[PDB]
Design goal:
Elements (H helix, E strand, L loop, with lengths): L13 E10 L2 E9 L5 E8 L4 H12 L11 E7 L3 E9 L6 H7 L11 H20 L2 E2 L8 E3 L5 E3 L6 E2 L8 H4 L9 H6 L4 H16 L14 H6 L12 H8 L12 H13 L3
Antiparallel strand pairs: 1-2, 2-3, 3-5, 4-5, 6-9, 7-8
Helix pairs in contact: 3-6, 3-9, 6-8
Bound molecules: the ligand Cn1cc(Nc2ncc(C3CN(C(=O)Nc4ccc(-c5ccccc5)cc4)C3)nc2C(N)=O)cn1 and chloride ion (2 copies).
Family: Belongs to the protein kinase superfamily. Tyr protein kinase family. AXL/UFO subfamily.
Subcellular location: Cell membrane
Protein name: Tyrosine-protein kinase Mer
Length: about 280
């Protein structure tokens, strides 16, 4: 617990509020972070072997991310459960609107946000491509890019989030392998399905799936196809079908993310420019 990058926030400064989400590998909770001047701040808390010092170093590296389309880590708190075991807790800024996937579903209800215009849908994709272009430059592999892991800020801009399964290219990954094997198969590139080996081209494939999720307003990828058939399905050349009212140009941008050879897929900088140009060409 040396903490050379000063990422740890004193546990006494944090009071855990209500639970927002609960999964097999942890939970998201509301919280108040008592700032130095006595003012409490609204934050979200992510709760959960390998030496915890490595977790803090990765957290410290993400704390240095400065891009409006990438969530910013505030710090880490350590909790001692049952019989003296250090359990880290990621402190994130509180984001009212929640995840993009749920938001898209809510928009199809009379009570939710109004019908999302095509230009707003295309702007969500540009925001994700900008965040992914920034992470891609820093040699970061997200490895879990999906609309459910993109957060909506209060000003309605999207940011890429959920870096629990991330890895810097060339860095160690042994203690993440168990969690990687349980990842949803419908977002995984054809070459990564075989042994769960990822490249930046695996994130490009998942970005195309994320674009299709936004264009269909929250549909689960591949209707009619079960998870156990996914590898065979892609092996036969089949891909996500064109969503209704999706511009043929937009669908071509998504289809380029799913080319069999990872080297044939474009980069996030190319995708980002194509989406910004497509967005400019509309009323
Ligand atoms: C119903 N509702 C829910 C909400 N709000 C939320 N719900 C979900 C989330 C997701 C948790 N996220 C996230 O980034 N986790 C994450 C990031 C980094 C690391 C990590 C791991 C190792 C090393 C370094 C870093 C681990 C996990 C986003 N955030 C919020 C929010 N921020 O307000 C509002 N309404
Ligand atoms: Cl489909
Ligand atoms: Cl089609």
């Amino acid at each position: 617990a040396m903490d050379p990058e000063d990422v740890v926030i004193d546990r006494n400064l944090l009071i855990l509020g209500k639970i927002l989400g609960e999964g097999e590998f942890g939970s998201v909770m509301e919280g108040n972070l008592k700032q130095e001047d006595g003012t409490s701040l609204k934050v979200a808390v992510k709760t959960m072997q390998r030496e915890i010092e490595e977790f803090l170093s990765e957290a410290a590296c993400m704390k240095d991310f400065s891009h409006p389309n990438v969530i910013r880590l505030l710090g880490v708190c350590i909790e001692m459960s049952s019989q003296g075991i250090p359990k880290p807790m990621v402190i994130l800024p509180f984001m009212k609107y929640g995840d993009l996937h749920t938001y898209l579903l809510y928009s199809r209800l009379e009570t939710g946000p109004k019908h999302i215009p095509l230009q707003t849908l295309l702007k969500f994709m540009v925001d994700i491509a900008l965040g992914m272009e920034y992470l891609s430059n820093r040699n970061f592999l997200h490895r879990d890019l999906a609309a459910r892991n993109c957060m909506l800020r209060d000003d309605m801009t999207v940011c890429v989030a959920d870096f629990g399964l991330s890895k810097k290219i060339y860095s160690g990954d042994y203690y993440r392998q168990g969690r990687i094997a349980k990842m949803p198969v419908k977002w995984i590139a054809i070459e990564s399905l075989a042994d769960r080996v990822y490249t930046s081209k695996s994130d490009v494939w998942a970005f195309g799936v994320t674009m299709w999720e936004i264009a269909t307003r929250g549909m689960t990828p591949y209707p009619g196809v079960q998870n156990h058939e996914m590898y065979d399905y892609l092996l036969h050349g089949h891909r996500l079908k064109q969503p209704e009212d999706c511009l043929d140009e937009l669908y071509e941008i998504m289809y380029s993310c799913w080319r069999t050879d990872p080297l044939d897929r474009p980069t996030f900088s190319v995708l980002r420019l194509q989406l910004e140009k497509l967005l400019e060409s509309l009323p």
